[PDB]
Design a protein around this ligand. Structure first.
Ligand SMILES: CCCCCCCCCCCCCCCCCC(=O)OC[C@H](COP(=O)([O-])OCC(O)COP(=O)([O-])OC[C@@H](COC(=O)CCCCCCCCCCCCCCCCC)OC(=O)CCCCCCCCCCCCCCCCC)OC(=O)CCCCCCCCCCCCCCCCC
Ligand SMILES: CCCCCCCCCCCCCCCCCC(=O)OC[C@H](COP(=O)([O-])OCC[N+](C)(C)C)OC(=O)CCCCCCCCCCCCCCCCC
Ligand SMILES: CCCCCCCCCCCCCCCCCC(=O)OC[C@H](COP(=O)([O-])OCC[N+](C)(C)C)OC(=O)CCCCCCCCCCCCCCCCC
Lengths: 228, 98, 50, 89
């Protein structure tokens, strides 16, 4: 990870949070249909390790990490006086407190000495499972496939898109239209234009996470118990 | 009305630590992710199973007296009045969640 | 490749695969129109008889 | 058990729908190769279950495979629930 050295000095782990993922519950509630009855309970689960895992953002550890990085930025601003600059970094900057990295952005240059055999399997799986879907041959980034729906829309997602800078929004739309045109013929880009895994940047996950936190803010500081 | 007497501003925050990262980050390091093993994480998730987790050691602590490594690190940071330790809000739950 | 400037096919490609061969004696595509309408006739014929 | 069979039938038909959750926030993510492979498995299990259900009238040993196929059918995930991952208070 490009963020790792910072995480190194805050006493955190240099390894992606994609590892350490674990099952803590038996039943998955609230039960959601249209799963089949037994599957609706969630006793037996099928995962490909590429789920969003958004609800795990409601943790004290993640907040501590975010505030540690923010405190580093504020300390630098106090020393130098470039506060403005340091609070307007692009969320793809490793110093931004909400920096997020896909597991494959560092799977090729990972330490791999501290990984459990299960975690080594996870690394190999991340690379190969990315290769299988062939969104890298469509000239597309993974976050381009995070799109909202007409009904049951993902609210955060919509906001996450409106926070993008104008040029990045336009580039996202243009990539999506090119992928649409390619998909008409089920065509791929020339083999030299394949997306390298380290180029598959997660440019929308920081905005997504910031929106999630801002939406939970008012819940934890209620005006009153029976308040909208 | 005319003469402006001088008073110190941040006198309270003098001699308090101003280093960041601090010493605690070196002595509560967690280079291997969460400090709890997978099975343990599964036990502490349920209030019932949690009771079964601490009763396996009759001479061990209880739910109200067990502290995790992350909690120890946060308490250590809080105690040392570091200037740059911005405290984090614990996850607050409404009725149904509880 | 992350800042596109083109769709799927380049002009050259489309000029070699999709565009019909030119007929200098027929600059108004009477041949194409005649063929397409004649080829539509059997569809209408089958539907009518059916 | 007849009552249990009726209950399972009603629950099956009701769980094919998407009427719950009603007011909890839910949204649908993408689909992947694993889900498509499991969909093929669902098709296989349904067909085998039909054939075996009709065969068991003369051959008692096929009850094992009929029950196995029905169990495999009843535990098929159509909607991958983001509630599979969360923390505890
Ligand atoms: C078949 C299992 C049937 C029993 C059952 O529900 O098991 C799952 C239930 C918890 O399942 P889970 O998926 O871990 O649920 C976690 C939840 O946070 C729920 O965790 P939980 O432990 O809170 O759920 C049990 C909860 C009762 O929980 C509820 O009322 C709501 C949640 C029920 C579980 C989900 C639906 C189950 C059907 O019990 C109580 O509230 C007891 C009183 C506690 C008072 C507060 C503490 C003292 C002050 O209990 C157990 O797993 C314990 C037995 C485990 C045995 C194998 C080891
Ligand atoms: C055979 C099944 C192996 C398996 O589930 O491994 C995943 C598990 C962890 O997966 P998990 O914790 O996400 O879920 C266990 C599997 N289900 C969901 C079915 C309960 O890996 C290990 O247990 C690692 C073992 C080696 C390191 C210790
Ligand atoms: C009205 C609803 C919408 C219809 C839209 C169009 C549907 C798709 C196109 C039609 C496809 C089928 C064409 C069949 C033609 C061949 C048979 C035929 O007519 O033979 C002529 C010949 C003509 O016989 P004849 O007796 O006149 O010939 C003279 C013979 N000598 C002198 C020796 C006695 O046979 C008949 O007409 C027999 C009676 C009518 C047979 C009808 C066949 C089935 C028609 C429906 C098939 C379509 C799918 C099912 C639809 C069901 C709807 C309820």
């Amino acid at each position: 990870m490009n963020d790792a050295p910072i995480l190194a000095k805050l006493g955190l782990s240099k390894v992606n949070t994609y590892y350490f993922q674990r099952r803590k519950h038996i039943f998955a509630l609230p039960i959601t249909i249209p799963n089949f009855p037994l599957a609706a309970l969630g006793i037996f689960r099928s995962t490909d390790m590429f789920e969003e895992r958004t609800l795990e953002r409601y943790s004290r550890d993640e907040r501590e990490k975010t505030l540690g990085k923010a405190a580093l930025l504020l300390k630098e601003a106090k020393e130098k006086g470039n506060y403005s600059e340091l609070v307007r970094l692009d969320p793809t900057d490793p110093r931004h407190p909400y920096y997020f990295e896909h597991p494959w952005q560092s799977a090729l240059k990972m330490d791999t000495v501290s990984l459990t055999p299960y975690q080594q399997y996870l690394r190999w799986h991340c690379l190969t499972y990315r290769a299988m879907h062939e969104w890298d041959r469509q000239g597309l980034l993974y976050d381009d496939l995070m799109q909202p729906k007409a009904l049951a829309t993902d609210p955060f997602l919509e906001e996450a898109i409106l926070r993008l800078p104008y040029n990045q929004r336009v580039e996202r739309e243009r990539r999506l239209s090119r992928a649409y045109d390619l998909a008409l013929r089920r065509e791929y880009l020339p083999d030299e234009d394949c997306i390298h895994p380290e180029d598959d940047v997660a440019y929308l996950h920081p905005y997504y996470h910031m929106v999630v936190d801002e939406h939970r803010e008012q819940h934890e500081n209620p005006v009153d118990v029976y308040s909208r | 009305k005319r003469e402006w007497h001088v008073v110190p501003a941040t006198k309270k925050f003098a001699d308090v630590p101003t280093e960041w990262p601090a010493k605690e980050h070196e002595r509560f390091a967690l280079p291997y992710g969460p400090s709890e093993g997978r099975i343990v994480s599964f036990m502490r998730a349920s209030r019932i199973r949690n009771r079964l987790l601490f009763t396996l050691n009759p001479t061990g602590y209880t739910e109200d007296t067990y502290v995790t490594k992350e909690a120890l690190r946060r308490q250590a940071l809080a105690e040392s009045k570091n200037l740059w330790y911005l405290p984090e809000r614990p996850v607050v739950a409404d009725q149904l969640e509880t | 490749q992350l800042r596109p400037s083109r769709g799927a096919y380049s002009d050259e490609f489309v000029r070699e695969n999709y565009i019909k061969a030119a007929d200098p004696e027929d600059p108004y595509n009477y041949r194409s129109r005649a063929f397409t309408y004649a080829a539509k006739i059997p569809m209408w014929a089958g539907l009518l008889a059916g | 058990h007849k009552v249990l069979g009726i209950i399972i039938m009603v629950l099956f038909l009701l769980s094919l729908t998407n009427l719950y959750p009603i007011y909890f926030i839910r949204f649908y993510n993408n689909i992947n190769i694993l889900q498509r492979s499991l969909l093929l498995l669902l098709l296989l299990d349904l067909v085998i279950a039909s054939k075996l259900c009709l065969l068991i009238n003369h051959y008692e040993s096929f009850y094992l495979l009929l029950i196995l196929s029905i169990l495999c059918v009843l535990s098929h995930h159509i909607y991958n629930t983001s509630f599979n991952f969360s923390n505890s208070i």
